[PDB]
Amino acid sequence: LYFQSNAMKPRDINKLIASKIFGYEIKDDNIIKDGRYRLGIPLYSQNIESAWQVVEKLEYDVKVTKTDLKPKYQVHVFVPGGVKMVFAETAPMAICKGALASV
Amino acid sequence: NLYFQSNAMKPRDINKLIASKIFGYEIKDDNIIKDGRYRLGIPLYSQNIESAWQVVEKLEYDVKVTKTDLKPKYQVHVFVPGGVKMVFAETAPMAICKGALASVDIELQ
Structure with a gap:
């Protein structure tokens, strides 16, 4: 489920950027590479x-x-x-x- | 002939110009001198x-x-x-x- 937001918190935008622009997999708000290594966003x-x-x-x-x-x-x-x-x-x-917006 | 081409400009030279011409900082020996006695790098x-x-x-x-x-x-x-x-x-x-x-009349080619 999703909803169009007029203004989102930076933390949330950083996640959307991480996945939509850089194609990273996000899990519990961390970037997870190769399905097992975590990184901060x-x-x-x-x-x-x-x-x-x-x-x-x-x-x-x-x-x-x-x-x-x-x-x-x-x-x-x-x-x-x-x-x-x-x-x-x-x-x-x-x-x-x-x-x-471009995606 | 009134104008002449300067010597080559390295990034570090551009930085010095920025510091002084844009920020108005005091520059002495490639350092920003704060309070006339304390120095910082550019x-x-x-x-x-x-x-x-x-x-x-x-x-x-x-x-x-x-x-x-x-x-x-x-x-x-x-x-x-x-x-x-x-x-x-x-x-x-x-x-x-x-x-x-360029906004302070210093073109760069």
Whole structure:
């Protein structure tokens, strides 16, 4: 079961990114490789370093814009035929939201 | 002939320029001198995305960072009132620094 959320907690977004963008298997909120080795999940939606892994991982062109408006950041992901667009107060969250929108 | 081409610029040189021209830090012997007596190293602005993002949020203009699959890979827009400053680079950190310096009248080829 699933539900469309208007705004999800970073911890939850990091899991969606882990599996949907990086294809990792998640189990009880950990990444599990080869079905037996556990790893913690990167804070994609909080660190720009982690979030940048997202930017590079995506196959599409990506635009990150910083302004002084509200919300501060805007991200564009150019999916074939159409472009996804999102807003967020931080670059890492706008990046993750854009990535998830393109999938 | 009024202008001349400078000596080669290494990433570490770009970082020094960022520290002083963008952050206004005190630079003495490749160090950021805090309180005129305490020194720190200069962050890898042109190499680390965390350091480079500090530059993004420092610049007072809107900034845009684009990653494309064509070349050069990265493009940065710094929206200076006079007219946007756009640069290219193979990495986001370097493109960010190149664009920040262009916003302070320091082009880089």
